[PDB]
Amino acid sequence: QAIAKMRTMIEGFDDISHGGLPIGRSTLVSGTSGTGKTLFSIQFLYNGIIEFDEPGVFVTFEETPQDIIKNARSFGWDLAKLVDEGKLFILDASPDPEGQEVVGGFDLSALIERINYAIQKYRARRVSIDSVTSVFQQYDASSVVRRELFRLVARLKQIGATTVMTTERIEEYGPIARYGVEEFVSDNVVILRNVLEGERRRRTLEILKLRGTSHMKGEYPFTITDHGINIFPLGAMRLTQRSSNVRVSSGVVRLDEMCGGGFFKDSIILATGATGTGKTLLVSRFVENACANKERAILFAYEESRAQLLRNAYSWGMDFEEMERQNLLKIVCAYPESAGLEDHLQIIKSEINDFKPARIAIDSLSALARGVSNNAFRQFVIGVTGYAKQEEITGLFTNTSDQFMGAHSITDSHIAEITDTIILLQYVEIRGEMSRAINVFKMRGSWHDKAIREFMISDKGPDIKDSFRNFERIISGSPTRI
Amino acid sequence: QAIAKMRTMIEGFDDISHGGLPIGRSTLVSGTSGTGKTLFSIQFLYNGIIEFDEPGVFVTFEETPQDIIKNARSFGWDLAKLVDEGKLFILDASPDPEGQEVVGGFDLSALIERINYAIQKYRARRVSIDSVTSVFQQYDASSVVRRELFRLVARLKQIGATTVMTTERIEEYGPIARYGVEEFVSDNVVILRNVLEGERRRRTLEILKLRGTSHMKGEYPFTITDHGINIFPLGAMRLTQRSSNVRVSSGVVRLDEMCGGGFFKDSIILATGATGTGKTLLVSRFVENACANKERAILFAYEESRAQLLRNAYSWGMDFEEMERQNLLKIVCAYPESAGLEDHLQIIKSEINDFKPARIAIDSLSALARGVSNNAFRQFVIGVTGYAKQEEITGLFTNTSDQFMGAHSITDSHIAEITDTIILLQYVEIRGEMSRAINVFKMRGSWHDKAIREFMISDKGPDIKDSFRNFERIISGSPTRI
Amino acid sequence: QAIAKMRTMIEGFDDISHGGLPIGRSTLVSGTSGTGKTLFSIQFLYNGIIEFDEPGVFVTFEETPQDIIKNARSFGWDLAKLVDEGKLFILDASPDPEGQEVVGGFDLSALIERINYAIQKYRARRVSIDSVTSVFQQYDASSVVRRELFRLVARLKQIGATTVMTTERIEEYGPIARYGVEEFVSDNVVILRNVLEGERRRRTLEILKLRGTSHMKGEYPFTITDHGINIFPLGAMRLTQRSSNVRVSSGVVRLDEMCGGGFFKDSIILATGATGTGKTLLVSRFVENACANKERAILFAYEESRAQLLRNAYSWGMDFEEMERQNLLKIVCAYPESAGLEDHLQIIKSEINDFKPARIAIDSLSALARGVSNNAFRQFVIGVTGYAKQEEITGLFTNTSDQFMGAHSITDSHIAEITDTIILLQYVEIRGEMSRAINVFKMRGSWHDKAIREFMISDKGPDIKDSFRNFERIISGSPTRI
Ligand SMILES: Nc1ncnc2c1ncn2[C@@H]1O[C@H](COP(=O)(O)OP(=O)(O)OP(=O)(O)O)[C@@H](O)[C@H]1O
Ligand SMILES: Nc1ncnc2c1ncn2[C@@H]1O[C@H](COP(=O)(O)OP(=O)(O)OP(=O)(O)O)[C@@H](O)[C@H]1O
Ligand SMILES: Nc1ncnc2c1ncn2[C@@H]1O[C@H](COP(=O)(O)OP(=O)(O)OP(=O)(O)O)[C@@H](O)[C@H]1O
Ligand SMILES: Nc1ncnc2c1ncn2[C@@H]1O[C@H](COP(=O)(O)OP(=O)(O)O)[C@@H](O)[C@H]1O
Ligand SMILES: Nc1ncnc2c1ncn2[C@@H]1O[C@H](COP(=O)(O)OP(=O)(O)O)[C@@H](O)[C@H]1O
Ligand SMILES: Nc1ncnc2c1ncn2[C@@H]1O[C@H](COP(=O)(O)OP(=O)(O)O)[C@@H](O)[C@H]1O
Ligand SMILES: [Mg+2]
Ligand SMILES: [Mg+2]
Ligand SMILES: [Mg+2]
Ligand SMILES: [Mg+2]
Ligand SMILES: [Mg+2]
Ligand SMILES: [Mg+2]
């Protein structure tokens, strides 16, 4: 029949690969130094032993087994334990650090026989090699490498164990492997990258090909945590979601009225407008209302410290510290520069999975956009939006405009298109003095107030008034009286 | 007379090539690892045997016949069956995986004689080689490769069988082949690419040349499905279409009136405007009307999940689930990121060919533009537009504006130029409050209402009113009363 | 257990590295000529001896010990003293400057044994090598280098001392090391760069990898001072800050009133507007008020010399020279071109740490933006903003607009988003003549006056009037009377 696959149990990878790696065949994993190729290899064998009770063999040329164990330990697991139990075997084929003699092609034959023995001895199902170039570096000829890799691949295929071979690159977008032949010999090729753009590094995983089967294509970003490799295949995200007719309060009565009876629990709300329009007040009231009803909520802060958030909240009549004491409100403060954009996604998911909030709020999306491309930014927002909706978490987001009394409160980001409810705030010029205006622009699941209303901010929170009747051109930031 | 060609029966390819490959000559197919060169080769021989009852020979150097069969099976056909029947022959010229000796140029002579024998034995008409570099890699000299390929090409020409040779590249836009001679020796050259741009891969096929004959030029995108290679030569699409005078209802009476008695069945309708203007309502009513008249329709959703579409439809009085139960309405939900733009085209065609809809609708074209270049986007839209018109399927499309009460509802995409009927929606400022406006901008086949009218959205669907008499500058988003 | 690290006591480095270098392992430090690789090496051993009383070994191939001592002295410390005391040892393995014979691989074995001896003799904990290529340059083979470095790394690992090896590059964004193998052999890789962009050099440090542990990623800028290497890991900066409810006067009564009772002591104030709106007056009054209350303040001047600042201050009734005499006011004048942007940050911190000001003011941020990218500029501003708030220093900043009576006083820089209080100044056209207007746009911790007021400048300082009642479109720069 068709080719079967073996699950790696690596988050994201198994979805990108459509079920894991081809069984009874090798896969070649490449990349430049620092991409964590050896982490993939260890995590693969590790998960096999733990999850499927499948023994495996790790072949090492470049590292003493002592360091392999010591390094793996940083991810919360003990490989030495698995070795003692007869589940994991490490085949030491490293060169002598005190002086190593030159060898010929017999080295490959000797290697394979030792691997075969180890596989049979431990009935290994999963095998990996830290560096195939350990036996190619011995010579310059690329034609020889083609043949030598062919022999290694075909021989492990004879055995039938699933194999993960590791090779290496100099360039990110250059040749897949050093000799320019290896990627043609291998039937299954995966490349890891650690691309430097601007001043930042972004890790990605790609499956170049899998002969005889299917997979997702393109570069899929990933990070490395204390649990090992975590891949974020946004294209694998589903639109299968549970809708609701449940309403929740924003903490602001006139706003709830404008939204036709509050906001939907499963909706995503985006508040936009110029800095100083009180977006942080709407956020504070949102999380406060959740706490008022004994619901858990998380605020992700980027522009203001906790000490300042507490002060500003008190000036608006909100006791943030009390909400923390009751374990209802969490404050998560971090600079955009403290983590990669993909790490912010992981942080948000981690805090949510741990605290199990009913609602979350983001202090500023425009802050996160600060250090990234438009593509990186929109993918982040989509990922968060999807997750929050799939988890049925009420979400409140903000996006700051740079138009100082210029109205025209629109986004180059275009997040409103994927968001449910849009709240627009702006400054206006009235009788020679500045004021503020609020409008509910849209709401997918309901009727909403179309009026453009004046509002002010007091020590009791927001103060919403009636519409600007007999004015024109409010949307320009400079209304005319008529 | 003139050079005759042999049809490959590969979709798109035979149109690009103007009738297939030159008969009695070789064609050299190149490309980087992962381009599926071996798929073209197998599909070529396979179709010959099935469609024209033409036996063929597959020469393998890099892969065991067992894997060739096993891999081919993923595309829904059994090559082993064809081998047993004496239709397909695989010539195994692979190196010994357990140790291979060095050989000279006699290897090429021996190869050709075995190929000649196999061709005569099975009366093969179609022959292919998986890797010509299998006998070039043996040495570094490029001058030798020129001669060695010349010998192979000329010898197979003596036989008269049509040949598809495969070679390989390192770079996408670099040399056609490794030694920089092969593309001059071969008289017919085809290059496959798997170009990485941004984070995504895009497959293309190009015919570089065919000596003595004609072909289409440039890169033509393609994808790979469970049926093998599927090429999309948009430039080969025809303007020969059947026009009609049949009208269909949009589900909205006042809109049908503005269009002069409904929309034409063979027309393409584009609705544009800012988010929240109710474009999703017009789409829902469009497919609903088709179902009301017992016509099949497909909705392609990108921005909202099925669960949410059902909720929003119910809030507007439309029972989507009932229309699904009667097998009239289909909901196809996918993220733009879940597939390549060219795959979305294939998905749309597949669903249409299967369900045979009278009408289709696209939830958002701007969503599909999100992750692609302007060139990739416009080609997609043209391809869909052409197909839908050729198939006489009523089509409804949308394009979201980013102008929040800014009117000026125009597209940087310029899809209106190829579309028949244009509907414009916008937000306006009236008496200090927001409202909506609708206008039929054009309709190629009819008279239409030129008025700019106010409208609202209720639980019964759209509510269209009369024109904004005694107002000026409506089109700016900020009308003045006079 | 997990891998332990050794603190280098190098500012910034220990935070980027999450605790310093892995213990009992080597780290490879690379970079092009002029990156100061030898400074890192010396500073590392130096700090070990001084701070932790840890003896060390410096291995030299390229420089006579006499020059190593002489060069180190420029940073305020005497290595010769440490040698005499038996704390520091320099191993001289340099070639004979009067003629050097060719040697083989025995040179590496001899080297290591001498290093081992020196380590044991002085009980060294910290070891470093100035140039590993000193024994690789002897031959061209890259395969040999792989092995030779492996031997050196593994051998020093046997000893257990923490090692800092130095290698070299030709290109900034090219291969990590000359032979393209070294970065794979080493388990811990750090790269220094001195990147030339435009006409300026910018130094950065990056940790490419640390096997078995964690670190911050990406390029982190640094400078070199008379105290050695000083790294500025902005991403490691904290949002943990102490808020306050203390108010301070700006020196301008009507402005203090508009801000609701003065400005907060812990706040950052940004004044924006066209050139000539009197931003330098607000700055002068700010520092003057601090002095009036016997508080120390520093003015950082970029656009005007001290002599001119004194003249302009006297014309506005402010005796700057007297404030200097009392050691309350400091004037720091420098051109933006006189130092790197990162050096301006270091200068600001240095002057603050020395003088212990209650308040600081920046004459022009737009001046500093003049010669730098938007990314370099915003990181600078964030760094200063963070530092000033963490140190509880009242900060006043300015940003000049290029709109001559065009109002629209907005910033492409978007510094207002991270700043607390925003003051906007603009020119307006009134009755055929130019005038000025002032508005408090926002204040995070308080109520503020929303009015747009007229103002003038006299010899007594600023003169603020009442609001522009019965005017419209003030924000455009061209108000209309109505
Ligand atoms: N606890 C951790 N948390 C986060 N990142 C970690 C942690 N522990 C290790 N890392 C990261 O894991 C990376 C994986 O190293 P790995 O050896 O697998 O990369 P590699 O591509 O194989 O490198 P090499 O070419 O040297 O073999 C390390 O470089 C380090 O950046
Ligand atoms: N069922 C399938 N659906 C979609 N794609 C598939 C399916 N089965 C296989 N593929 C794709 O078909 C591609 C064709 O592989 P093929 O060997 O022809 O490429 P190639 O250029 O010849 O590769 P190579 O250089 O290794 O020989 C595979 O890499 C895989 O991405
Ligand atoms: N007092 C000082 N103040 C500022 N910079 C200084 C001072 N003294 C030295 N420098 C800088 O320190 C740099 C460090 O030189 P160093 O040898 O460490 O660089 P390097 O990368 O190792 O150079 P090389 O490749 O020659 O060995 C010098 O090039 C010089 O620019
Ligand atoms: N006690 C108060 N009384 C009146 N207005 C206040 C008070 N405290 C703060 N403000 C208002 O709050 C605004 C800050 O709102 P905020 O939500 O932080 O704006 P942003 O959109 O940037 O997030 C200030 O500009 C000021 O107008
Ligand atoms: N029951 C309702 N009654 C009144 N208005 C509604 C109702 N349900 C939804 N709406 C309106 O429908 C709008 C959404 O229209 P939609 O077609 O989804 O906009 P879009 O152009 O983005 O696709 C909301 O902004 C709201 O004005
Ligand atoms: N004695 C004075 N009397 C009146 N106006 C003065 C006097 N001295 C200077 N000015 C005003 O001060 C302005 C300069 O203000 P300044 O703070 O230097 O502007 P900038 O925003 O560039 O920093 C001059 O354009 C002038 O209008
Ligand atoms: Mg490794
Ligand atoms: Mg804010
Ligand atoms: Mg192939
Ligand atoms: Mg929509
Ligand atoms: Mg040096
Ligand atoms: Mg000035």
Active site residue B62: yes
A448 within 8 A of A259, measured Cβ to Cβ: yes
Name which of C57, C62, C17 is nearest C167 in CA terms.
Answer: C62
Please name the residue that has the structure tokens 């959740």.
A290
- The one catalytic residue in B11, B62, B324, B391 is B62
Q: Which residues surround ligand 1 with Cβ inside 6 Å?
A: A 31, 33-39, 74, 224-226; C 184, 209-211, 213-214
B5-236 and B247-481 in the same fold: yes
Q: How many Cβ atoms from other residues are within 10 Å of residue C434's Cβ?
A: 11
> What are the angstrom distances between the C-alpha of A403 and each of A277, A425, C321, C382, C399?
11, 11, 41, 21, 16
- Written as one string, the DSSP assignment of B191-243 is EEEEEEETTEEEEEEEEEEETTS----S-EEEEEETTEEEE--GGG-------
Please count the residues of chain A. Answer: 482
CB of A98 within 8 A of CB of A128?
A: no
3-state DSSP assignment of residue B407 = coil
Give the closest residue to C179 by CA, choosing from C133, C246, C239. Answer: C133
User: Which protein residue's CA is at the shortest distance from atom 25 of ligand 6?
Assistant: C276
Residue A243: is it exposed, middle or buried by C-beta count within 10 angstroms (0-12/13-18/19+)? buried
**Burial category of A86 from C-beta neighbours within 10 Å (exposed 0-12, middle 13-18, buried 19 and up):** exposed
Distance CA B453, CA C42 (A): 79
Q: How far apart are CA A333 and CA A354, in angstroms?
A: 17
**What's the half-sphere exposure (Cβ side, CA atoms, 13 Å) at A122?**
27
Find out whether C226 and C76 touch, Cβ atoms under 8 Å.
yes
Q: Is C238 annotated as a binding residue?
A: no
Residues A237/B335, Cβ–Cβ less than 8 Å: yes
Interatomic CA distance for residues C286 and C281, integer angstroms: 8
* Residues B391/B352, Cβ–Cβ less than 8 Å: yes
Query: CA-based Rg of chain C, rounded to a whole angstrom?
Result: 28
As a CATH number, domain C5-236 is 3.40.50.300
Residue type for B147, please? Answer: R
Contact across the interface for A209 and B34, Cβ inside 8 Å: yes
Within 10 angstroms of residue B91's Cβ, the number of other Cβ atoms is: 19
Q: Do B333 and A173 touch (CB under 8 A)?
A: no
A439/B435 touch (CB, cutoff 8 Å), yes or no: no
By Cβ distance, the residue of B140, B201, B371 closest to A217 is B201
Q: Rounded CA gap, A130 and A42, in Å?
A: 9
How far, in Å, are A278, A406, A453, B412, C175 from residue A463 at the CA level?
11, 22, 10, 40, 61
Interhelix angle C37-51/C65-72, rounded to 10 degrees, is 80
Tokens of A331: 């404050």
Here the tokens at position A293 are 């009803």
Among the bound ligands, the one closest to the CA of C363: 12
Pairing between strand C359-362 and A268-274? Answer: unpaired
What is the β-pairing status of strands B453-458 and B433-443? antiparallel
The Cα–Cα gap between B449 and B424 comes to 12
Chain B residues inside the 8 Å CB shell of A439 = 434
A227 phi, psi to nearest 5 deg: -110, 5
Cα(A462)–Cα(A66) distance, rounded to whole angstroms? Answer: 62
When scoring C202, C475, C476 by the number of chain A Cβ atoms within 10 A, the one with the most, hence best to mutate, is C475
Q: Tell me the longest C-alpha to C-alpha distance in chain C.
A: 95
**What are A213-216's contacts with CB under 8 Å, separation 24+?**
A213/A2, A213/A3, A213/A5, A213/A18, A213/A22, A213/B71, A213/B74, A214/A18, A214/B74, A214/B226, A215/A16, A215/A17, A215/A18, A216/A15, A216/A16, A216/A17, A216/A18
| Residue found by looking up tokens 């500073």 in the block | C43
Tokens of B196: 């990485």
Distance CA B356, CA B432 (A): 48
Q: What CATH number should be reported for the domain whose range is C247-481?
A: 3.40.50.300
Chain centre distance of CA C98: 44
Of all ligands present, the nearest one to the C-alpha of A187 is: 2
Instruction: Give A-chain residues touching C439 at CB under 8 angstroms.
Output: 434
User: Which residues partner with C231 through β-bridges?
Assistant: C222
Q: Rounded to the nearest 10 degrees, what angle do helices C341-355 and C374-390 cross at?
A: 10
Pairing, β C5-6 against β C21-22: antiparallel
∠ CA C136-C141-C144, nearest 5°, is 65
Phi, then psi, of B250 in degrees rounded to 5 = -85, -5
Q: How far apart are CA C426 and CA C414, in angstroms?
A: 18
Residue nearest to atom 6 of ligand 4 (CA): C447
Per-residue tokens: B311: 């909720």
How far apart CA B345 and CA A35 sit, in angstroms, is: 35
3-state secondary structure of B32: coil
Resolution of the entry in angstroms: 3.8
Relative to the CA of C131, which ligand 3 atom is closest?
Answer: 27
| The amino acid at B248 | V
Instruction: Kindly list the residues from chain C whose CB atom is less than 8 angstroms away from the CB atom of residue A478.
Output: 472-473, 475-476
Catalytic: A62? yes
| Encoded tokens for A416 | 């409103």
Which residue in C167, C158, C132 sits closest to A97, CA to CA? C158
**Structural contact between residues C479 and A441, judged by C-beta atoms closer than 8 angstroms:** no
Determine which helix (DSSP H) or strand (DSSP E) holds B301, and give its type and residue range. Answer: strand B297-301
Q: Which of B33, B70, B479 sits opposite A3 (nearest CB)?
A: B70
Ligand 2 contact, B100 CB (< 6 A): no
Tell me if C228 sits within 8 A of C71, measured CB to CB: no
Q: Which residues contact C448 (CB under 8 A, 6 or more apart)?
A: C258, C259, C260, C440, C442
3-class SS shares of chain B: helix, strand, coil, % to 5: 35, 25, 40
| Gap between the Cα atoms of A371 and B455, Å rounded | 42
Residue corresponding to tokens 């005796």: C319
Helix then strand then coil, % of chain C, to nearest 5: 35, 30, 40
Q: Which residues contact A183 (CB under 8 A, 6 or more apart)?
A: A28, A30, A175, A176, A177, A189, A208, B33, B34
CA atoms within 13 A on the CB side of C17: 27
Q: Is C32 in the pocket of ligand 3 (CB under 6 A)?
A: no
Minimal Cα distance from A364: which residue of C? C417
Copy the structure tokens of residue A376: 């990186």
Residue C70 CB coordination number (10 Å) = 13
Three-state DSSP state, B424:
strand
The residues lining ligand 6, judged by C-beta closer than 6 Å to any ligand atom, are C 275-281, 315, 457-459
Residue B403 and residue B280: Cα distance in Å, rounded? Answer: 17
Q: Quick check: helix, strand or coil at residue B105?
A: coil
CA separation for the pair B361, B359 (Å, rounded)? 7
Q: Which of B11, B63, B257, B303 is catalytic?
A: B303
Task: Please tell me the number of Cα atoms within 13 Å of B15 on its side-chain side.
Answer: 12
Residue of A360, A426, A411, A430 whose CA lies nearest to A388: A360
Distances (CA, A) of C392 to A70, A454, B194, C242, C327: 44, 36, 56, 8, 20
Name the experimental technique: cryo-EM
In chain C, where the domains are located:
5-236, 247-481
Which position among A62, A257, A324, A392 bears the catalytic label? A62
Choose the closest CB to A241 out of B33, B307, B402: B307
Dihedrals phi, psi of C472, to nearest 5 degrees = -125, 155
- Map chain A to HEC letters: CCCCEECCCCCCHHHHCCCCEECCCEEEEEECCCCCHHHHHHHHHHHHHHHCCCCEEEEECCCCHHHHHHHHHHHCCCHHHHHHCCCEEEEECCCCCCCCCCCCCHHHHHHHHHHHHHHHHHCCCEEEECCHHHHCCCCCCHHHHHHHHHHHHHHHHHHCCEEEEECCCCCCCCCCCCCCCHHHHCCEEEEEEEEEECCEEEEEEEEEEECCCCCCCCCEEEEEECCEEEECCHHHCCCCCCCCCCEECCCCHHHHHHCCCCEECCCEEEEEEECCCCHHHHHHHHHHHHHHCCCCEEEEECCCCHHHHHHHHHCCCCCHHHHHHCCCEEEEECCHHHCCHHHHHHHHHHHHHHHCCCEEEECCHHHHHCCCCHHHHHHHHHHHHHHHHHCCCEEEEEEEECCCCCCCCCCCCCHHHCCCEEEEEEEEEECCEEEEEEEEEEECCCCCCCECEEEEEEECEEEEEEECCCEECHHHCCCEEC
CB-CB under 8 Å, A74 with C212: yes
End-to-end CA distance of chain B: 78
Local structure of residue C235 (DSSP, 8 states) = G
Please, what is the Cα angle at C113 between C108 and C114, to 5 degrees?
100
Sequence-distant (6+) residues with CB within 8 A of B152 are B108, B111, B112, B132, B165
Type of residue numbered B90 = I
CB-based contact B218:B208 (threshold 8 Å): no
Render C252-300 in DSSP notation, one character per residue. Answer: -HHHHHHTTSSEETT-EEEEEEETTSSHHHHHHHHHHHHHHTT--EEEE
DSSP state of C52: S
Rg (alpha carbons) of chain B, rounded to whole number: 28
- Cβ-defined contact of A481 to C472 (cutoff 8 Å): yes
Q: Is B275 in the pocket of ligand 5 (CB under 6 A)?
A: yes
DSSP for C391-419, written as a single string: TT-EEEEEEEE--TT------SS-GGGT-
| Structure tokens, C215 | 């670190």
- Region of C77 please: left (phi>0), alpha (psi -120 to 50) or beta: beta
Residue with tokens 């340059």: C137
Binding site, annotated residues of A: 34-39, 74, 209-211, 213, 215, 225-226, 275-281, 303, 316, 436, 442-444, 446, 448, 450
What six digits make up the tokens of B314? 């119910």
Q: Which two tokens stand for residue B400?
A: 């979201």
Residue type, C409: S
How far are the Cα atoms of C428, C478, C481, C482 from residue C407, in angstroms, in the given order? 7, 8, 17, 19
Tokens, residue B183: 């593309």
Give kind and range of the element (H or E) at residue B28.
strand B26-31
Residue A418 CA, ligand 10 centroid: distance in Å: 8
Cβ-Cβ contacts under 8 Å for B396 (sequence gap 6 or more): B268, B269, B271, B282, B283, B286, B359, B360, B361, B362
Q: How far is A185 from chain B (nearest CA, A)?
A: 7
User: Which of A109-117's residues contact partners 24+ apart within 8 Å by CB, and which partners?
Assistant: A109/B99, A111/A59, A111/A135, A111/A152, A112/A151, A112/A152, A112/A155, A112/A156, A115/A57, A115/A59, A115/A91, A115/A156, A115/A159, A116/A155, A116/A159
Catalytic-role residue among C11, C257, C295, C303:
C303
**What value does the CA radius of gyration of chain A take, rounded to a whole number of Å?**
28
Backbone angles phi, psi at B15, to 5 degrees: -85, -40
DSSP state of B184: H
At B30, phi and psi to the nearest 5?
-120, -175
Chain A residues with beta carbon closer than 8 angstroms to that of B370: 378
Looking at all shown ligands, the one closest to residue C282's CA atom is 6
**Ligand 3 atom nearest to C166, measured from its CA:** 22
Cα of A439 vs its chain's centroid, Å: 33
Q: Which residues contact C84 (CB under 8 A, 6 or more apart)?
A: none
Hey, what's the torsion of the CAs at C209, C214, C216, C218, to 10 degrees? 20
Rounded to whole angstroms, the Cα distance separating C394 from C388 reads 7
Query: What whole-number distance in Å separates Cα of residue A311 and Cα of residue C420?
Result: 13
| DSSP 8-state assignment for residue B48 | H
- Pairing verdict, β A263-264 and A359-362: unpaired
Tell me if B401 CB under 6 Å of ligand 5. no
- In the sheet with C228-231, reading across from the earlier edge strand, the strands are C88-92, C56-60, C126-129, C162-166, C26-31, C188-197, C200-210, C220-225, C228-231
For B350-358, the CB contacts below 8 A with 24+ separation are B351/B298, B351/B300, B352/B298, B352/B387, B352/B391, B352/B393, B355/B296, B355/B298, B355/B330, B356/B296, B357/B290, B357/B295, B357/B296, B357/B297, B357/B298, B357/B330, B357/B393, B358/B265, B358/B290, B358/B295, B358/B296, B358/B297, B358/B393, B358/B394
Torsion angle, CA of B203/B209/B213/B218, rounded to 10 degrees?
A: 40
How buried is A482 (Cβ within 10 angstroms: 0-12 exposed, 13-18 middle, 19+ buried)? exposed
